[PDB]
Motif scaffolding. Structure first.
Motif, PDB file in Angstrom:
ATOM      1  N   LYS A 123       1.167   4.038  -3.122  1.00  0.00           N
ATOM      2  CA  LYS A 123       0.255   5.137  -3.214  1.00  0.00           C
ATOM      3  C   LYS A 123      -0.256   5.432  -1.817  1.00  0.00           C
ATOM      4  O   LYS A 123      -0.077   4.577  -0.932  1.00  0.00           O
ATOM      5  CB  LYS A 123      -0.931   4.736  -4.145  1.00  0.00           C
ATOM      6  CG  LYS A 123      -1.625   3.458  -3.767  1.00  0.00           C
ATOM      7  CD  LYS A 123      -2.876   3.215  -4.650  1.00  0.00           C
ATOM      8  CE  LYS A 123      -3.525   1.850  -4.406  1.00  0.00           C
ATOM      9  NZ  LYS A 123      -4.720   1.731  -5.311  1.00  0.00           N
ATOM     10  N   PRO A 124      -0.909   6.598  -1.596  1.00  0.00           N
ATOM     11  CA  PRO A 124      -1.240   6.928  -0.182  1.00  0.00           C
ATOM     12  C   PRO A 124      -2.177   5.993   0.519  1.00  0.00           C
ATOM     13  O   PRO A 124      -2.030   5.789   1.716  1.00  0.00           O
ATOM     14  CB  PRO A 124      -1.803   8.336  -0.260  1.00  0.00           C
ATOM     15  CG  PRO A 124      -1.200   8.907  -1.482  1.00  0.00           C
ATOM     16  CD  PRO A 124      -1.129   7.751  -2.464  1.00  0.00           C
ATOM     17  N   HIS A 125      -3.079   5.337  -0.215  1.00  0.00           N
ATOM     18  CA  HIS A 125      -3.880   4.228   0.375  1.00  0.00           C
ATOM     19  C   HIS A 125      -3.121   3.110   1.013  1.00  0.00           C
ATOM     20  O   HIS A 125      -3.573   2.574   2.001  1.00  0.00           O
ATOM     21  CB  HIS A 125      -4.939   3.634  -0.627  1.00  0.00           C
ATOM     22  CG  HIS A 125      -6.152   4.489  -0.761  1.00  0.00           C
ATOM     23  ND1 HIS A 125      -6.501   5.133  -1.935  1.00  0.00           N
ATOM     24  CD2 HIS A 125      -7.057   4.892   0.171  1.00  0.00           C
ATOM     25  CE1 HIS A 125      -7.562   5.897  -1.717  1.00  0.00           C
ATOM     26  NE2 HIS A 125      -7.931   5.747  -0.458  1.00  0.00           N
ATOM     27  N   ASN A 126      -1.942   2.783   0.498  1.00  0.00           N
ATOM     28  CA  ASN A 126      -1.109   1.667   1.008  1.00  0.00           C
ATOM     29  C   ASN A 126      -0.025   2.159   1.979  1.00  0.00           C
ATOM     30  O   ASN A 126       0.882   1.409   2.278  1.00  0.00           O
ATOM     31  CB  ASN A 126      -0.426   0.976  -0.219  1.00  0.00           C
ATOM     32  CG  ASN A 126      -1.434   0.186  -1.072  1.00  0.00           C
ATOM     33  OD1 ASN A 126      -2.437  -0.264  -0.533  1.00  0.00           O
ATOM     34  ND2 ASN A 126      -1.170  -0.020  -2.345  1.00  0.00           N
ATOM     35  N   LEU A 127      -0.041   3.438   2.340  1.00  0.00           N
ATOM     36  CA  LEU A 127       0.963   4.002   3.278  1.00  0.00           C
ATOM     37  C   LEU A 127       0.238   4.316   4.557  1.00  0.00           C
ATOM     38  O   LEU A 127      -0.687   5.128   4.561  1.00  0.00           O
ATOM     39  CB  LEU A 127       1.593   5.239   2.725  1.00  0.00           C
ATOM     40  CG  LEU A 127       2.278   4.909   1.390  1.00  0.00           C
ATOM     41  CD1 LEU A 127       2.758   6.153   0.704  1.00  0.00           C
ATOM     42  CD2 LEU A 127       3.384   3.887   1.510  1.00  0.00           C
ATOM     43  N   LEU A 128       0.546   3.568   5.587  1.00  0.00           N
ATOM     44  CA  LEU A 128      -0.267   3.628   6.824  1.00  0.00           C
ATOM     45  C   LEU A 128       0.501   4.309   7.935  1.00  0.00           C
ATOM     46  O   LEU A 128       1.707   4.460   7.842  1.00  0.00           O
ATOM     47  CB  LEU A 128      -0.752   2.239   7.282  1.00  0.00           C
ATOM     48  CG  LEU A 128      -1.523   1.398   6.250  1.00  0.00           C
ATOM     49  CD1 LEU A 128      -1.857   0.030   6.790  1.00  0.00           C
ATOM     50  CD2 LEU A 128      -2.753   2.064   5.649  1.00  0.00           C
ATOM     51  N   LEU A 129      -0.218   4.726   8.995  1.00  0.00           N
ATOM     52  CA  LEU A 129       0.412   5.480  10.079  1.00  0.00           C
ATOM     53  C   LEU A 129       0.159   4.762  11.431  1.00  0.00           C
ATOM     54  O   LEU A 129      -0.963   4.301  11.692  1.00  0.00           O
ATOM     55  CB  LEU A 129      -0.196   6.872  10.075  1.00  0.00           C
ATOM     56  CG  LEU A 129       0.394   7.985   9.183  1.00  0.00           C
ATOM     57  CD1 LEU A 129       1.591   7.634   8.356  1.00  0.00           C
ATOM     58  CD2 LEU A 129      -0.627   8.734   8.367  1.00  0.00           C
TER      59      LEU A 129
END
Ligand SMILES: CN1CCN(c2ccc(OCc3ccccc3)c(C(=O)Nc3cccnc3)c2)CC1
Length: 261
Positions: A123-129
């Protein structure tokens, strides 16, 4: 020494099983993400999977330290934050940024699945940049082995986050790992392109999920999405996991291969 080597500056978030903190070294000022667990031995499994990871679209594991009952997990800090913060509520993001992040998500997921690991909470919380906005799949607290010695094992634990979870995980006693991660990726893509999640959960008691099954894409979030990516989403968000598109086929999709900007 840890309290004398590292200063815990702030809370970054909580994984499914634990909490992680921005830590800065008291000599070097090097900034890292540290997961600290009060030691049940789920952590042993988490560590062991973290040791396997070596890919551009997966977070970097530095290593671990056990002091007292407490375990310390050190990882690369994602200087870009999370993908969640790039999603403008009700809007999403520009379609070309979405596509690039989706290419990168698929690269990371292909990698994991090729080492026989399923993340289970994409989910976007666990996808980091990182600094160059390269996406990195983080948080291995629910990750598990689904393939070992070339034999697949079915999953039977419900976990994840309801709006990201595939409908089979709510209904079946056992299910295949890969199609569940593909599902969640489709919800992430929805979020990127519409800035909103389509349903609380993919069950019949949920009207918005029924609407989608009846193909009412004249409604939100679908009406915000261009026809090419929507066509992809129709292949991903398919209720029957055995008819759901697989990643190799995603890589042949029209929108996935569309030159954008
Ligand atoms: C300028 N700052 C830089 C750092 N910024 C930032 C914000 C949230 C983060 O993690 C949220 C999270 C996601 C999953 C689980 C727990 C927490 C991390 C981060 O680096 N976390 C991380 C790194 C490696 C492994 N695990 C987590 C970094 C925010 C913007």
């Amino acid at each position: 020494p840890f309290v004398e080597d590292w200063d815990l500056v702030q809370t970054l978030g909580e994984g499914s099983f634990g909490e992680v903190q921005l830590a800065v070294n008291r000599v070097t000022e090097e900034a890292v993400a540290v997961k600290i667990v009060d030691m049940p031995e789920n952590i042993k499994k988490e560590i062991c999977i973290l040791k396997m990871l070596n890919h551009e679209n997966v977070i970097k594991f530095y290593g671990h330290r056990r002091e007292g009952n407490i375990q310390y997990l050190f990882m690369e800090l994602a200087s870009g934050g999370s993908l969640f913060d790039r999603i403008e509520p009700d809007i999403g993001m520009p379609e070309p940024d979405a596509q690039r992040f989706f290419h990168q998500l698929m690269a990371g997921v292909v990698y994991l699945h090729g080492i026989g690991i399923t993340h289970r909470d994409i989910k976007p919380h666990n996808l980091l940049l990182d600094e160059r906005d390269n996406l990195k799949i983080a948080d291995y607290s629910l990750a598990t082995v689904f393939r070992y010695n070339n034999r697949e094992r079915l999953l039977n634990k419900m976990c994840g986050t309801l709006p990201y979870v595939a409908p089979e995980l709510l209904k079946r006693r056992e299910f295949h790992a890969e199609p569940v991660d593909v599902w969640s990726c489709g919800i992430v893509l929805t979020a990127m392109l519409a800035g909103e999640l389509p349903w609380d959960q993919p069950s019949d008691s949920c009207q918005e999920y029924s609407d989608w099954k009846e193909k009412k894409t004249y409604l939100n979030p679908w009406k915000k999405i261009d026809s090419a990516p929507l066509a992809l989403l129709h292949k991903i968000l398919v209720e029957n996991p055995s008819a759901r598109i697989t990643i190799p086929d995603i890589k042949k999709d029209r929108w996935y291969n569309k030159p954008l900007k």
